[PDB]
Amino acid sequence: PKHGKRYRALLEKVDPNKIYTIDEAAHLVKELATAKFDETVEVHAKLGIDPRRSDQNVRGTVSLPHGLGKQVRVLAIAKGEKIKEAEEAGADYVGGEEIIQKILDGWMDFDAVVATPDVMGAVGSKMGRILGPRGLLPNPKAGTVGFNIGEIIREIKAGRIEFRNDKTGAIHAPVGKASFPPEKLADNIRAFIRALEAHKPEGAKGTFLRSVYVTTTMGPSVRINPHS
Amino acid sequence: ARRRRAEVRQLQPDLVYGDVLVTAFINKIMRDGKKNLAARIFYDACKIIQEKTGQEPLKVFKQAVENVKPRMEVRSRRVGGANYQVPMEVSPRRQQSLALRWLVQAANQRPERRAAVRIAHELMDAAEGKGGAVKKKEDVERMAEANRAYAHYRW
Amino acid sequence: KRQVASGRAYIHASYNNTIVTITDPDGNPITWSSGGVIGYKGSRKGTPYAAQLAALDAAKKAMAYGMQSVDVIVRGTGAGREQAIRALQASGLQVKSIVDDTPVPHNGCRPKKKFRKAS
RNA sequence: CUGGUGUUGGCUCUUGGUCGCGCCUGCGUAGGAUAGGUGGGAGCCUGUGAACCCCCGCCUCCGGGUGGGGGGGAGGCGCCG
RNA sequence: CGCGGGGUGGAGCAGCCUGGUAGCUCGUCGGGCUCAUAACCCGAAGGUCGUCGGUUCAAAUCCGGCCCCCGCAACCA
């Protein structure tokens, strides 16, 4: 039919009109993660803004207190002592100056792509037309720019994520997995809600937080309470 | 031809491949009875078809006169002080004369030095279907099957 | 919206364009078509080929409307007319029957001087 | 001249533009098709009937997406390419 | 002056909105064609997407300042 038998049974333990604070949501998402693998906890929401202008288009970063649990393979396009700086801190691919010569025919997606301030004249024409809207853009507001490139890679491998606003006007980003207890999920979902409060654009009027959903990869969502 | 139905002029089998069609194409390749340098050219073409494509030249030539024959066309014919461009399938004889003549004309609008390579490179393209000669076939049928409004005057 | 398989198809064939309407059993337009609806304009509308297309187009635009069988009624003259009937048939419809209902005055209004050559 | 109200009351029908949601849709081209967009995903859809054969509601930029009933028995969809 | 819609070949205009697509049409021009021309049909010269900076690994697009046209109701000491 329209739905399933492993999906719909999850539509019995959650009332949409019953606002489950991140505690009755972090206790109920522990009974939504039924999968061969270990799911995640997709955290979504609809902000009170306008995604068509550039005064309220929220974006940035934020480290979650417990992390995620899903390892991300971060690489680099260094310049100087920032080639051995990302290789002492822990990086898969690093300072090869222009290793853009390998990735120009093929490639089966690793995870990340960082750089630095001086390789901006040609770090736009080589691999600036490929990963573009493929969310791997070395955007400095995204957190992938700077001479401190090996210092920004020990937190994206140990917790920190990225929440960007899309064309429509919402804010996504995972805050853990499905095997994370009621303490690791609920406390973490609190260090990402400040990231939407503190990064809250200026020209945005009204009650910024219209909604804040929290579900599980292949499971139903809960219109969780905003601050708690 | 106002009395008898004209009279189909009869060709003379091609001395190398047999077919009468062959010599006909040459008759067009020709200018001023220079039937030799005329004939000559046609073959030299095949020598390229042979080296450029391991396909028998004849087998190619035939298939190039085919993929070009225009199945229908437009011919003027007034009825009431108006020149409609009525379309009607074309005689299987004219259906050949056209294709042949065009393959020749086209083969002379290409930027190729020796005449040989022209008739050759062209033919090879008439078969594949992508040629300047194949072109008219298309632009002569796009004509009819467009003016198919005046069809009803099929004299 | 509503969908009914039984129908009635009208052929108003004139001189400058053949036109056809397809109604329901009560005679209410479900959809219509004409030499103008198709790409044609001007004189080549009155031509039969146009009539055919019009009929076909009318059929399909009537078919996907829940049609299956129609009652044909022609009116007028002009080339197109004929082709139009034959077109409705070999087109996928069901010509249940054809009638020739051309309007004729039992001598009423005087016609224009064009139509009055019949002095 | 005119809109709103007051004097101004009964009885059904019709139907918008908001806003309560329950719910339903999307395609230039290259491309097996009809890929709105961001985030998640290496996994789920079937014995509460899957490949397909028959029928209808619906939508149409008419290729085809969509969802229920009824034949039938175990095969689908995607990562990857 | 406050509000908001966009400048794109010679001209206009879809793309924007929903990121990476110079697409639609006529003039131009070589040619096919026909008595002649339009239509039809192939091929091509012509777009810094107003401009300037940033956001962009990529911007006609998101975009901050901005040149100018349009629309707009008010006001006018």
Swiss-Prot record, chain A:
SUPFAM superfamilies: Ribosomal protein L1 (SSF56808). Keywords: Repressor, Ribonucleoprotein, Ribosomal protein, RNA-binding, rRNA-binding, Translation regulation, tRNA-binding. GO terms for molecular function: rRNA binding; structural constituent of ribosome; tRNA binding. InterPro entries: Ribosom_uL1_bac-type, Ribosomal_uL1, Ribosomal_uL1-like, Ribosomal_uL1/biogenesis, Ribosomal_uL1_3-a/b-sand, Ribosomal_uL1_CS. GO terms for biological process: regulation of translation; translation. The keyword Hydrolase does not apply. GO terms for cellular component: large ribosomal subunit. The keyword Ribonucleoprotein applies. CDD domains: Ribosomal_L1. Belongs to the universal ribosomal protein uL1 family. PANTHER family: 54S RIBOSOMAL PROTEIN L1, MITOCHONDRIAL, LARGE RIBOSOMAL SUBUNIT PROTEIN UL1M. NCBIfam families: rplA_bact (TIGR01169). Directly binds to 23S rRNA. Forms what is known as the L1 stalk, which protrudes beyond the 70S ribosome surface. The stalk is preferentially stabilized in 70S versus 50S crystals. Interacts with the E site tRNA, blocking the exit path. This blockage implies that this section of the ribosome must be able to move to release the deacetylated tRNA. Part of the 50S ribosomal subunit. This is Large ribosomal subunit protein uL1. The gene is rplA.
From Swiss-Prot, chain B:
It comes from the Bacteria. One of its GO terms (molecular function) is rRNA binding. Pfam families: Ribosomal_S7. InterPro entries: Ribosomal_uS7 (IPR000235), Ribosomal_uS7_bac/org-type (IPR005717), Ribosomal_uS7_CS (IPR020606), Ribosomal_uS7_dom (IPR023798), Ribosomal_uS7_dom_sf (IPR036823). One of its GO terms (cellular component) is small ribosomal subunit. Keywords: Ribonucleoprotein, Ribosomal protein, RNA-binding, rRNA-binding, tRNA-binding. GO terms for biological process: translation. Belongs to the universal ribosomal protein uS7 family. NCBIfam families: rpsG_bact. Part of the 30S ribosomal subunit. Contacts proteins S9 and S11. Binds to the C-terminus of IF3 and to the C-terminus of Era. One of the primary rRNA binding proteins, it binds directly to 3'-end of the 16S rRNA where it nucleates assembly of the head domain of the 30S subunit. Is located at the subunit interface close to the decoding center. Binds mRNA and the E site tRNA blocking its exit path in the ribosome. This blockage implies that this section of the ribosome must be able to move to release the deacetylated tRNA. This is Small ribosomal subunit protein uS7. The gene is rpsG.
From Swiss-Prot, chain C:
InterPro entries: Ribosomal_uS11, Ribosomal_uS11_bac-type, Ribosomal_uS11_CS, Ribosomal_uS11_sf. Part of the 30S ribosomal subunit. Interacts with proteins S7 and S18. Binds to the C-terminus of IF-3; however exactly how IF-3 interacts with the 30S subunit is unclear. May contact the C-terminus of Era. Pfam families: Ribosomal_S11. Coiled coil: none annotated. GO terms for biological process: translation. Keywords: Ribonucleoprotein, Ribosomal protein, RNA-binding, rRNA-binding. Residues 99-119 are annotated as: Disordered. One of its GO terms (cellular component) is ribosome. It comes from the Bacteria. This is Small ribosomal subunit protein uS11. Belongs to the universal ribosomal protein uS11 family. Residues 109-119 have a biased composition (Basic residues). NCBIfam families: PRK05309.1, uS11_bact. Located on the upper part of the platform of the 30S subunit, where it bridges several disparate RNA helices of the 16S rRNA. Forms part of the Shine-Dalgarno cleft in the 70S ribosome, where it interacts both with the Shine-Dalgarno helix and mRNA. The gene is rpsK. One of its GO terms (molecular function) is rRNA binding.
